[PDB]
Amino acid sequence: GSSGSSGRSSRTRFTDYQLRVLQDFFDANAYPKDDEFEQLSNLLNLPTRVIVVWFQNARQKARKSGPSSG
Numbered sequence: 001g002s003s004g005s006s007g008r009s010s011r012t013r014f015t016d017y018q019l020r021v022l023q024d025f026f027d028a029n030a031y032p033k034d035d036e037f038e039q040l041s042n043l044l045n046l047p048t049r050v051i052v053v054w055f056q057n058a059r060q061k062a063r064k065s066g067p068s069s070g
Contacts, residue, residue, distance in 0.1 A: 010053070018044045022051065026058050 014022060021044055029036070032055075037048045044051075 012050055018046070022054060026055060030055060030059055
């Protein structure tokens with residue numbers, strides 16, 4: 001099969017302007033539907049596919065366990 005070349009191989013970098021809306025929309029909602037995703041894609045002018053991958057991960061990083069409190 002494939003030796004490696006694993007990861008994202010997307011080469012997509014967002015700017016504060018975009019990260020602001022993307023991160024802002026996540027802090028409020030991280031489980032939006034296609035209809036919603038479009039709102040961001042139309043504003044940032046980015047493909048939902050790109051916003052999805054970003055939102056998906058953001059969730060994984062958010063999940064944490066341990067002696068953490070707050």
